[PDB]
Amino acid sequence: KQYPIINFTTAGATVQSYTNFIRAVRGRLTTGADVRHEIPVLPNRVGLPINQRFILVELSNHAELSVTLALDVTNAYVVGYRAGNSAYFFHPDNQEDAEAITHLFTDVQNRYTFAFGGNYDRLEQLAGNLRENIELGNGPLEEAISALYYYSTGGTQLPTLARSFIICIQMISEAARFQYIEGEMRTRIRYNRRSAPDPSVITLENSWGRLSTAIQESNQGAFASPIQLQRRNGSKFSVYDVSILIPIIALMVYRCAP
Numbered sequence: 001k002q003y004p005i006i007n008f009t010t011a012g013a014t015v016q017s018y019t020n021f022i023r024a025v026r027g028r029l030t031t032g033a034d035v036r037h038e039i040p041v042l043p044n045r046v047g048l049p050i051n052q053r054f055i056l057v058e059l060s061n062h063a064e065l066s067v068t069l070a071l072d073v074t075n076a077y078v079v080g081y082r083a084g085n086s087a088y089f090f091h092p093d094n095q096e097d098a099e100a101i102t103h104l105f106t107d108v109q110n111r112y113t114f115a116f117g118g119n120y121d122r123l124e125q126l127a128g129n130l131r132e133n134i135e136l137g138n139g140p141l142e143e144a145i146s147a148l149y150y151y152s153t154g155g156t157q158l159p160t161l162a163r164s165f166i167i168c169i170q171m172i173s174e175a176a177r178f179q180y181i182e183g184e185m186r187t188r189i190r191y192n193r194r195s196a197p198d199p200s201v202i203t204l205e206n207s208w209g210r211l212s213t214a215i216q217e218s219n220q221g222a223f224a225s226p227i228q229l230q231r232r233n234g235s236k237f238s239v240y241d242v243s244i245l246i247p248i249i250a251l252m253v254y255r256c257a258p
């Protein structure tokens with residue numbers, strides 16, 4: 001009757017407890033994934049039955065407020081969330097996706113669809129801040145959870161809601177997609193720090209779709225043409241093959257193979 005749920009709280013969160021959480025998220029996402037090749041491929045959108053389409057992530061904090069994010073298993077991205085008796089959805093791209101989300105949170109009294117989508121370019125505009133200037137960490141995540149809840153009571157304004165999406169998406173969706181970004185978050189939790197992400201994280205996020213295409217279209221592991229990434233100091237380098245990214249990227253959106 002309900003999609004699978006993973007739980008996480010920032011209250012007393014540790015390196016261990018955040019590691020368990022991301023591992024469970026990856027586990028639910030890859031139930032239907034293709035794991036025969038070097039890197040797991042998320043289920044194909046086309047033909048996926050509706051009862052396999054979503055998973056739910058339920059978050060709480062020291063103030064013991066709770067919100068629940070809905071994640072698409074085909075791309076591990078947040079499509080919307082529930083707070084109290086209300087559900088809120090990013091604007092869908094097409095009719096099929098609009099129909100799919102009517103199967104989420106079917107028991108809330110109030111359903112709203114934002115005019116905007118959930119991509120970073122738009123969310124950065126609404127927040128008034130680039131990812132480069134939005135701190136990540138347990139502290140920021142705790143604050144993001146309260147902000148998401150209080151949107152349903154009129155206590156949160158849309159720019160702060162946008163910045164809270166940016167924090168949640170990166171610390172959950174992107175940390176599940178990339179072992180590399182999980183480690184970046186793990187270091188922040190370990191030393192009790194909050195800091196904005198460096199250029200390597202942002203460029204990895206911006207490249208996930210392109211890397212999924214290059215990997216699944218590769219021939220004997222070799223890319224048909226290079227993809228350019230950044231080190232943490234902003235310097236640039238090229239990747240040419242699948243293998244060097246096996247420790248870096250954990251999940252891929254389905255791509256056709258010629």
Ligand SMILES: O=C(O)c1cc2c(s1)-c1ccccc1CC2
Nearest residue numbers: 200229230231232233244245248
């Ligand atoms: O700051 C650094 O030293 C590095 C950052 C990255 C490196 S190295 C990398 C090396 C191979 C393959 C993918 C990556 C992703 C980001």
Ligand SMILES: [Cl-]
Nearest residue numbers: 019179183186
């Ligand atoms: Cl480890």
Ligand SMILES: [Cl-]
Nearest residue numbers: 089101102111
């Ligand atoms: Cl809806």
Ligand SMILES: [Cl-]
Nearest residue numbers: 115116117122
């Ligand atoms: Cl808009």
